[PDB]
Amino acid sequence: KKTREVARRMDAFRGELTSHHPRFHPASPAACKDIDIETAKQIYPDGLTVGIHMGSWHQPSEPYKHDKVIEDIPYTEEDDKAIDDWVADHVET
Amino acid sequence: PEEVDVIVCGGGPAGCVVAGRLAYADPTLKVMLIEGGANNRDDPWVYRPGIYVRNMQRNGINDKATFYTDTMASSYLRGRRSIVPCANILGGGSSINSQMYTRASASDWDDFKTEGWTCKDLLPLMKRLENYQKPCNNDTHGYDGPIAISNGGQIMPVAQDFLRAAHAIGVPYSDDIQDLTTAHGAEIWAKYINRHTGRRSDAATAYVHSVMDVQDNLFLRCNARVSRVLFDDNNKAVGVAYVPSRNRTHGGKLHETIVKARKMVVLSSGTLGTPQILERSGVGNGELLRQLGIKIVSDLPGVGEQYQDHYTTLSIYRVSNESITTDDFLRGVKDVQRELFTEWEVSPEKARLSSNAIDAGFKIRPTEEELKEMGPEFNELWNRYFKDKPDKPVMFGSIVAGAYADHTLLPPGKYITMFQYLEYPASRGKIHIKSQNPYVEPFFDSGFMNNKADFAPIRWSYKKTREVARRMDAFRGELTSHHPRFHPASPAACKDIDIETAKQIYPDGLTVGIHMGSWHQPSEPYKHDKVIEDIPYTEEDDKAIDDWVADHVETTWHSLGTCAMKPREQGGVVDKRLNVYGTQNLKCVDLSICPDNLGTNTYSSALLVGEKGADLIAEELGLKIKTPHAPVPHAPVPTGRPATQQV
Amino acid sequence: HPEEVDVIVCGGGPAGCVVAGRLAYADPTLKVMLIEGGANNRDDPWVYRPGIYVRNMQRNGINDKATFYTDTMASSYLRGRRSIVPCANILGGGSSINSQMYTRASASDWDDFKTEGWTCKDLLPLMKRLENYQKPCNNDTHGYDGPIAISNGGQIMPVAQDFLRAAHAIGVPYSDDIQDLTTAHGAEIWAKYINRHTGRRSDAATAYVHSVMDVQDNLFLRCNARVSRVLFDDNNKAVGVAYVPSRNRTHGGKLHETIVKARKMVVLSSGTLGTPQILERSGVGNGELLRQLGIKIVSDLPGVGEQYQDHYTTLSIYRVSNESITTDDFLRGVKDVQRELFTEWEVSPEKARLSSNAIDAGFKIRPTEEELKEMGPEFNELWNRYFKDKPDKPVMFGSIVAGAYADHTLLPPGKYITMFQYLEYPASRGKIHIKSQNPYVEPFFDSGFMNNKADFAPIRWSYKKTREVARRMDAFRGELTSHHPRFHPASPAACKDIDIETAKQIYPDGLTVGIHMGSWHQPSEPYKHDKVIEDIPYTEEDDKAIDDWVADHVETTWHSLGTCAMKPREQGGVVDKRLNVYGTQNLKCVDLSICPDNLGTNTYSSALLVGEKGADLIAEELGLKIKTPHAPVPHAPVPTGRPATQQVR
Amino acid sequence: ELKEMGPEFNELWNRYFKDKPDKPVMFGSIVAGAYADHTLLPPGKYITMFQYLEYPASRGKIHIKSQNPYVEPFFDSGFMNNKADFAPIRWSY
Ligand SMILES: Cc1cc2nc3c(=O)[nH]c(=O)nc-3n(C[C@H](O)[C@H](O)[C@H](O)COP(=O)(O)OP(=O)(O)OC[C@H]3O[C@@H](n4cnc5c(N)ncnc54)[C@H](O)[C@@H]3O)c2cc1C
């Protein structure tokens, strides 16, 4: 949580790689916010696939603004469970 | 001109058949086709089949689709607002669709329970429209019609690989799964593509452009969005008003132009388009019309309601790097695009790009043993809808020789995706305008998964198509990221890319093979002689799949039923001849009229409603439809007999 | 090669080509010679590939497909500048090198020639006769077994429908055909003089001349041969012609003439610029001018070379987004872009991007009563006496080029569209006169542009309108400050240039993008689909900055006409109603020189028609029946005589 | 060159430079490239003449608008609010 609050406040921050994060319920206000459309389009600007919704694989971040007022992520008892599970699944030497 | 005979609002498949047939039938009949989207004539980002995928991008550039979002988050989709695009371009879906050739079954048309729409009623018309350019062991296909149907320029090795795995799991092979009788089998999947020219069979070129080249009596107006149908004192459709496609006038004012219609007004603006035109025209739900301030012409609460679709799931599998797939093309790798664009130009009759790269599939239907483990509420549906309707499949399944997914959320390497849709869903949605102004977003609700029956078949399809993936030669694993959230220790949990495939992706990579993070369970390196067993699934494995369906089920753009052809007292909107109730000289002819679903990608269905719709108007105007239709641009001269490929 | 033939056609432009080919085809016995100042154009890939037309106007010491006429004197009406007027120096003339926009004059234009045999009604069959119309329309006013192929090319550009949506949004109506002889106010997808099947430029040389020379042996072609003068009889009968090298490259530049005689007829088809010069130095023109030059008078026709008329072109340039398809990079010489288009054209020309002029939409327009008031005294006066009672005449023409038509040497990086504009019937009038009897010396010239105050307002008004189009387009990312009128920087009219985002794309690794220092442009706010848009208001000072921008940047449109006008002699005319030069026998001008007044159209159609009309006039004087169709045109498919689709490859 | 610089700079010259002969009026240098946004420049190569007025008569100010240290201050460069400054820059051009 602490390091996530750090991430979200970085000038570089453009989102959370959903695939490598806890299994939050999609509706959960803690759910991952992945890459934004503007960052994507730079990666494959000639690509035919960038910005296809179909699959609902990721909740896209909103484009970056230095102004964005930043409130801390609220986590439920449910969310805490998903981080726990994520910790047992992905903790290492 | 200010006044014509027949105005056809919306140039989708349906609207193109009507407008074309009628202008070619009597050259003194003036007909205007008003189409909100751009003209598609001789556009390489239309006529070349293998770029179709770009058309669903919400990148703020692509203007060839209008996207509807649910007004409200659905509980049934675990809090997510569904997105449902449709075509916004001349030829409708047919100018941007996946180009998959598929036909509904015989019982589907019979089950409209409507006179003139039996299967035996529409068999002639199903054939009237086709230019079938591929072998089959039956006589259900048409050989002198305007729409070309073929196996494309070049079939992908993975399709035959799929076909083999499908054999392994007890699904039989067929010459033709689109013979109106087939609910359960596997085929090489055809396309709306012309074998010889390598061009996409859009309906505008086939039925409209063709006629515009030989005659003066068919008028086309594109970039014109139909606001409303104008009515008489006596509810006779009298004309139409259209606006600019872009609301870009001085200070966003409403610049309507009106065109009168001496004889007929056809709404062919699609399942999502037609109800809105009706609604702002004063045909729809009295209360809604009252609140928005619209004069009630016909109180038809069926308008906007009983939205139906097919419910897609997209199961993505990692494959070998020597596999031939579309991924690098879709990424925009320069010399890969250059190669295929070039190739298509020089020899379109064999070009990879003369394909949608969706080259095999099945229609399937569960055994009794399969039924048992699908729970009560489907089993109910089954006994009431499927049990003694044996030509209706439950699930479509096909292999895309590439990842149909945002590659910006995909690891490197090649993929294939098992593109799946639910054939006859019980779930229902609706669509209603929120203003008279034709630019305000309507209320909308997909309604997906709001009936609990629809989960079991899609769960079954996930598992089943995974068995087909697992047994392929190309199979190098399952993409954890894009699959269900099984427990890591469940036999059901995904086995992602092996260490050997990975090493080819990045031979000078520094992170290929680092365990640290445990983000995947590596597949073992491929073996030809590996015995392969079914994945067992538990009750909690099962819950994970339902979760994944709820999280990742999508439209299949097969939208229909918003103006059901059934009696007015049943929630109807059109009579047996597609007249709108409580009105004169006004017909809905597009997919809006379907009172139930069809086991098919619905382009074939759209054109056929088009043809039947042409016949109906034609008998009313005392016109005789011409066969064959006006020659289709760029196309070889067709014989009208089954034939092979020319030099 | 013969020293004597029956007919000599002097100048192988469209008109000269129609004449030369139609008559030689009319009678296999009739020896006809076509004498053309410039080089032969046959199967030249820098002619027949339409998409390279732009270069034909390079003043770069290599290109020689053009002659450039400069105003002898500076003009106070162009704020001191010396107008430059090019024209073709190649077989086929304009048709070999032009921009290839198919446009047709309104019906009154012809009726208004006030001459019998030249009514719209008289000419309509001949309009159809020359056309191989290869595109849809909702009328029957086109032709379908003619030599000259007309279509929408291989591929229309997206900015063309972009333009059409914007056009609709400001109140210019869509139409299937703005070339129906009827339309003064409407927007269409603009067609081209390109064969949709072969992807080749429909030049007048291959259509009328090369056709015939491939099947017969009575059509002679002398290229690279400037026609100095016409040789006369004791009674002013044209008896033959003298011609010289294009290059005065003889030993000590001694003049080298070659005389070839005409038994029956001499036609001058050397253009609005060329034809008058052959008359004057032959002894036909202003008597006092011929007298000062030592040329014996033969006929004293002071109207020779007077009444130079044109369309007056303005080019408003707008920056566009980098995911837009434009020609700019091809125009810049970017090897792999050129390599791509050249390859695409050779492989499949039926659909190639080079089988186009990339001017793929536009409109003819007419002002509202509302809009007149904003114009001035002098133009409202012209309106009243010229346009008011002539509802099929458009005031201004506007079209979108899918690129920057200008020097890329003077343009920033990025992509542009330009709003190409011309004034359809100017009041202003120029002239051209030989300075010598020697035909290598430059003649006096005065384009005349804007020497009538009435020509300012309609152009000013086009600027405002074409801008309102641009700002309403999806591709729009600002005006190009450099190449726009000199607005006060704090006028609500002042230019909004490239936005920072379009800027960062052009040079993502540049250290310079977005440096304010200099305040050289006011950036645009980045593009929004949802932008509510309102019109630009202009103050009086804004209108002056535009008027000054017109004076400074107004240019020819190569639609030159009127230098040998068809009206009675005593009204300052040069030709009969059968195009006979007054005071002469067996001598005719047929090309746009004979026009008594202007035409609201790109004038390739007009010169072809004037051509066909001459073919008739001459043929019915020689007891000669014109054939239909013409000799089949090289590389072209056997047409059908009636409307039909794109065939199989 | 004085004579052509007009009355308001001349008075400043008499009061600030007349007998301060080590003080230059203008600075000028050659940037071996365009010091401008190349996104607004044609192609090719440039040099720029960088010039600045050494001792302007014109005066600006900066003033805060709030205790909060993140809010933009009031500001006025004051550039050219004294006509004396125009002549020497014109002379530099
Ligand atoms: C991305 C995509 C993929 C699909 N893939 C396949 C496939 O592979 N195979 C298959 O068989 N089917 C496919 N479908 C489904 C199929 O294309 C549709 O079922 C079919 O096009 C329906 O035809 P229609 O006339 O009912 O309406 P549509 O095809 O949707 O066309 C309706 C037209 O109405 C116009 N319009 C709408 N509102 C207005 C208005 N107010 N005024 C004026 N014009 C208006 C639109 O611009 C559009 O042109 C696909 C469709 C899409 C969009």
Ligand SMILES: Cc1cc2nc3c(=O)[nH]c(=O)nc-3n(C[C@H](O)[C@H](O)[C@H](O)COP(=O)(O)OP(=O)(O)OC[C@H]3O[C@@H](n4cnc5c(N)ncnc54)[C@H](O)[C@@H]3O)c2cc1C
């Ligand atoms: C760059 C350009 C762009 C334009 N674009 C378009 C367009 O997009 N659409 C359109 O409709 N129209 C266009 N036009 C206008 C159209 O092409 C001209 O109006 C038309 O070519 C003029 O026809 P003409 O027969 O009157 O004379 P010309 O075409 O000018 O032919 C005159 C010929 O005589 C030759 N000649 C000149 N003097 C002599 C001499 N003394 N002896 C021998 N030969 C001589 C010349 O080489 C030339 O071949 C354009 C023209 C140009 C040059």
